[PDB]
Amino acid sequence: YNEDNGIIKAFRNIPGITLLNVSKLNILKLAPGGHVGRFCIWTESAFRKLDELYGTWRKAASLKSNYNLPMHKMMNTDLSRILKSPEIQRALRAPRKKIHRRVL
């Protein structure tokens, strides 16, 4: 959330819940136990402030002075489409799926 108006009181008694602010994002609360992918529930303003707090690849962040979004290594992280694309298989080798086991 952002701009608290009493939401801590309403969410302070439910077990297993976690209260987090956009201006103060904690890794210990976002990825507990060292595993990513925790279910999140956002607000309209909390979701609109992310573009200004971290910035995009075109413009840097406005809240943070000298911070930019991390660089992206593999532009296409799907190995299946790359291996099955015609440009890759255009100059490949024969499969040669023969076993050639030991002969007595």
């Binding site: 060292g34 595993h35 990513v36 992918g37 992280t77 799907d78 190995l79 299946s80």
Partner: protein
């Protein structure tokens, strides 16, 4: 992004049980028990699964809709087949042969459907 998600789910993920020398993935939408990339049902854009019906007879088939992604409310379409031992076995085979829709794991789905029908018979 199937391989990117598999590089995270292959370990350090829930549902995984490897107490003995064998490992099991145990997803709610999965045909076999092996923790593999070709059989994981949470990371692909197209996934087929079979399940025993909740009423006590028949087989429910869950298919990944692929129309709206990142929307797990309607991301899976569930149908119910309650026929003889061969009509369901042929309908499930057609459901994967006629449409492309992940042509592999067809035999896996068929074997799981036959195995759950064997248990539904008594």
């Amino acid at each position: 992004s199937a391989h990117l998600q598999w590089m995270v789910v292959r370990n350090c993920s829930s549902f995984l049980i490897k107490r003995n020398k064998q490992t099991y993935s145990t997803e709610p939408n999965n045909l076999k028990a092996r923790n593999s990339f070709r059989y994981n049902g949470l990371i692909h854009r197209k996934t087929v699964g079979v399940e025993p019906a909740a009423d006590g007879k028949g087989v429910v088939v869950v298919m990944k809709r692929r129309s709206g992604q990142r929307k797990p409310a309607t991301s899976y379409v569930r149908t119910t087949i309650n026929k003889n031992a061969r009509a369901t076995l042929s309908s499930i085979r057609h459901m994967i042969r006629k449409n492309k829709y992940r042509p592999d794991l067809r035999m896996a789905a068929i074997r799981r459907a036959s195995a759950i029908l064997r248990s539904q018979k008594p």
